[PDB]
Design an enzyme around this catalytic site. Structure first.
Site, PDB file in Angstrom:
ATOM      1  N   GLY A 218       0.825  -1.184   0.000  1.00  0.00           N
ATOM      2  CA  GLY A 218       0.000   0.000   0.000  1.00  0.00           C
ATOM      3  C   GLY A 218       0.868   1.245   0.000  1.00  0.00           C
ATOM      4  O   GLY A 218       1.944   1.269   0.600  1.00  0.00           O
TER       5      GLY A 218
ATOM      6  N   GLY B 207       0.607   6.497   4.167  1.00  0.00           N
ATOM      7  CA  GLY B 207       2.047   6.343   4.075  1.00  0.00           C
ATOM      8  C   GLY B 207       2.331   5.195   3.137  1.00  0.00           C
ATOM      9  O   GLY B 207       1.533   4.909   2.236  1.00  0.00           O
TER      10      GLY B 207
ATOM     11  N   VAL C  96       3.012   1.119   3.051  1.00  0.00           N
ATOM     12  CA  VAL C  96       2.929  -0.116   3.820  1.00  0.00           C
ATOM     13  C   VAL C  96       3.635  -1.223   3.036  1.00  0.00           C
ATOM     14  O   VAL C  96       3.474  -1.350   1.812  1.00  0.00           O
ATOM     15  CB  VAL C  96       1.476  -0.494   4.195  1.00  0.00           C
ATOM     16  CG1 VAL C  96       1.416  -1.807   4.971  1.00  0.00           C
ATOM     17  CG2 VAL C  96       0.816   0.634   5.015  1.00  0.00           C
TER      18      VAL C  96
ATOM     19  N   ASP D 210     -11.566   6.441  12.088  1.00  0.00           N
ATOM     20  CA  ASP D 210     -11.524   6.041  10.677  1.00  0.00           C
ATOM     21  C   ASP D 210     -12.001   4.597  10.525  1.00  0.00           C
ATOM     22  O   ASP D 210     -11.355   3.771   9.869  1.00  0.00           O
ATOM     23  CB  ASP D 210     -10.116   6.231  10.092  1.00  0.00           C
ATOM     24  CG  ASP D 210     -10.112   6.320   8.564  1.00  0.00           C
ATOM     25  OD1 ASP D 210     -11.196   6.445   7.925  1.00  0.00           O
ATOM     26  OD2 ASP D 210      -9.043   6.281   7.910  1.00  0.00           O
TER      27      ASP D 210
HETATM   28  C1  LIG Z   1      -3.309  -3.800   3.276  1.00  0.00           C
HETATM   29  O1  LIG Z   1      -4.355  -2.868   3.561  1.00  0.00           O
HETATM   30  C2  LIG Z   1      -4.139  -1.651   4.183  1.00  0.00           C
HETATM   31  C3  LIG Z   1      -5.035  -1.237   5.172  1.00  0.00           C
HETATM   32  C4  LIG Z   1      -4.851  -0.018   5.819  1.00  0.00           C
HETATM   33  C5  LIG Z   1      -3.778   0.831   5.509  1.00  0.00           C
HETATM   34  C6  LIG Z   1      -3.633   2.158   6.257  1.00  0.00           C
HETATM   35  S1  LIG Z   1      -2.257   2.319   7.382  1.00  0.00           S
HETATM   36  C7  LIG Z   1      -2.001   0.903   8.184  1.00  0.00           C
HETATM   37  N1  LIG Z   1      -1.829   0.755   9.434  1.00  0.00           N
HETATM   38  N2  LIG Z   1      -1.652  -0.633   9.664  1.00  0.00           N
HETATM   39  C8  LIG Z   1      -1.711  -1.234   8.544  1.00  0.00           C
HETATM   40  C9  LIG Z   1      -1.608  -2.697   8.264  1.00  0.00           C
HETATM   41  C10 LIG Z   1      -1.311  -3.616   9.277  1.00  0.00           C
HETATM   42  C11 LIG Z   1      -1.229  -4.991   9.041  1.00  0.00           C
HETATM   43  C12 LIG Z   1      -1.456  -5.406   7.743  1.00  0.00           C
HETATM   44  C13 LIG Z   1      -1.781  -4.452   6.689  1.00  0.00           C
HETATM   45  C14 LIG Z   1      -1.854  -3.095   6.947  1.00  0.00           C
HETATM   46  O2  LIG Z   1      -1.957  -5.129   5.529  1.00  0.00           O
HETATM   47  C15 LIG Z   1      -1.732  -6.527   5.791  1.00  0.00           C
HETATM   48  O3  LIG Z   1      -1.450  -6.646   7.199  1.00  0.00           O
HETATM   49  O4  LIG Z   1      -1.942  -0.331   7.449  1.00  0.00           O
HETATM   50  C16 LIG Z   1      -2.860   0.469   4.515  1.00  0.00           C
HETATM   51  C17 LIG Z   1      -2.988  -0.745   3.835  1.00  0.00           C
HETATM   52  F1  LIG Z   1      -2.084  -1.063   2.881  1.00  0.00           F
END
Ligand SMILES: COc1ccc(CSc2nnc(-c3ccc4c(c3)OCO4)o2)cc1F
Length: 340
Positions: free
Chosen positions: A30, A35, A37, A145
């Site tokens: 992501g 940010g 990920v 959120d």
């Molecule tokens: C994959 O889906 C998403 C969901 C939310 C976000 C927003 S920020 C965030 N904070 N923790 C995460 C987080 C924590 C554990 C995870 C994760 C994202 O993906 C697979 O295992 O992501 C970004 C993403 F890319």
């Protein structure tokens, strides 16, 4: 990918004693407002982790990191480690529990296929979301959120974990907060009205929007704009009485039957739960802990309950004192005899 990264990372919950942590198979998964990920594999254990990387101002503390260092719950993505890294500038990196799926993705598969999510999953996923909220609300922390994208799923175990605390804040009574937050469809009415003195109950509205969405196969309040959103709600719930408007706001459709918005076969207790979440009056909404104790979830307390694959349900009753703090006698309902 093949490169091995070694950093000096600080345990998320433990004492502030940094360790060397090596990870590999690093790929971005992501890249948005939140940010960047990453998915990665820990070298020692072979465990997958997500790594959230955000730019840090260094002259300021990171709020998201402050909140995450406090949390330890089965329905919230755990902060395993954090570390800093440089560009040239400075980034904070949250090493998190990896979870393969999202409620958004899952709801969308069903919708695209013209199917509905089985009611057992709706119970499982909603319940775990409420536990996660009961837990965070017990610190006075509001997620702000709550939306299907931020609900992570492990389809094999039916575990749901709340993620993305980048909008989260400890709400202190008397300290004003920003009104334009949450994703639009899931945004509480008092927010659309501009309340700066809102409470954790905005999360509860959001959860109601999620629940309603899992039942219908589409967002219940699909606002065209930040302003059209209030119209979308009124269309479904009818004009708020002036008493309700006073409750939502620090300064002409009628009552639309709840059993007609949803499909004819929707379980009545799911509709009844929904109606107690999507109340105009913030303080009229169930507490997350109350939501957990609702009849809709009784099946989850049945001693014979199983996942569709025959497995036991995931942790559902391991309530701590912290989680129970808003209404401790609720432990009598929440924890069934067999679970004790
Ligand atoms: C994959 O889906 C998403 C969901 C939310 C976000 C927003 S920020 C965030 N904070 N923790 C995460 C987080 C924590 C554990 C995870 C994760 C994202 O993906 C697979 O295992 O992501 C970004 C993403 F890319």
């Amino acid at each position: 990918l093949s490169k091995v990264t070694t950093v000096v990372a600080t345990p998320g919950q433990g004492p502030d004693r940094p360790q060397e942590v090596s990870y590999t198979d690093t790929k971005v998964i992501g890249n948005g407002s939140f940010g960047v990920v990453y998915q990665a594999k820990l070298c020692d254990s072979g465990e997958l982790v997500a790594i959230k990387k955000v730019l840090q101002d260094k002259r300021f503390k990171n709020r998201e990191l402050q909140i995450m260092r406090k949390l330890d719950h089965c329905n919230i993505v755990r902060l395993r480690y954090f570390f800093y890294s440089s560009g040239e500038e400075v980034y904070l990196n949250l090493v998190l529990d990896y979870v393969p799926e999202t409620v958004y993705r899952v709801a969308r598969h069903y919708s695209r296929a013209k199917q509905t999510l089985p009611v057992i999953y709706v119970k499982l996923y909603m319940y775990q979301l409420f536990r996660s909220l009961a837990y965070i609300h017990s610190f006075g922390i509001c997620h702000r959120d709550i939306k299907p994208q931020n609900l992570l799923l492990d389809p094999d175990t039916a575990v749901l974990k709340l993620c993305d605390f980048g909008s989260a804040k400890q709400l202190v009574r008397g300290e004003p907060n920003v009104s334009y937050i949450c994703s639009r469809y899931y945004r509480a009415p008092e927010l659309i009205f501009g309340a700066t003195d809102y409470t954790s109950s905005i999360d509860v509205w959001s959860a109601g929007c999620v629940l309603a969405e899992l039942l219908l196969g589409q967002p219940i309040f699909p606002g065209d704009s930040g302003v059209d959103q209030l119209v979308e709600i009124i269309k479904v719930l009818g004009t708020p009485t002036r008493e309700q408007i006073r409750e939502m706001n620090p300064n002409q459709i009628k009552a639309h039957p709840w059993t007609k918005v949803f499909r004819p076969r929707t379980p009545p207790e799911a509709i009844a739960l929904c109606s107690r979440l999507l109340e105009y009056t913030p303080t009229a909404r169930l507490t997350p802990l109350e939501a957990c104790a609702h009849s809709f979830f009784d099946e989850l307390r049945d001693p014979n309950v199983k996942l569709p694959n025959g497995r036991d349900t995931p942790a559902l009753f391991n309530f701590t004192t912290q989680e129970l703090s808003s209404n401790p006698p609720l432990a009598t309902i929440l924890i069934p005899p067999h679970a004790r």
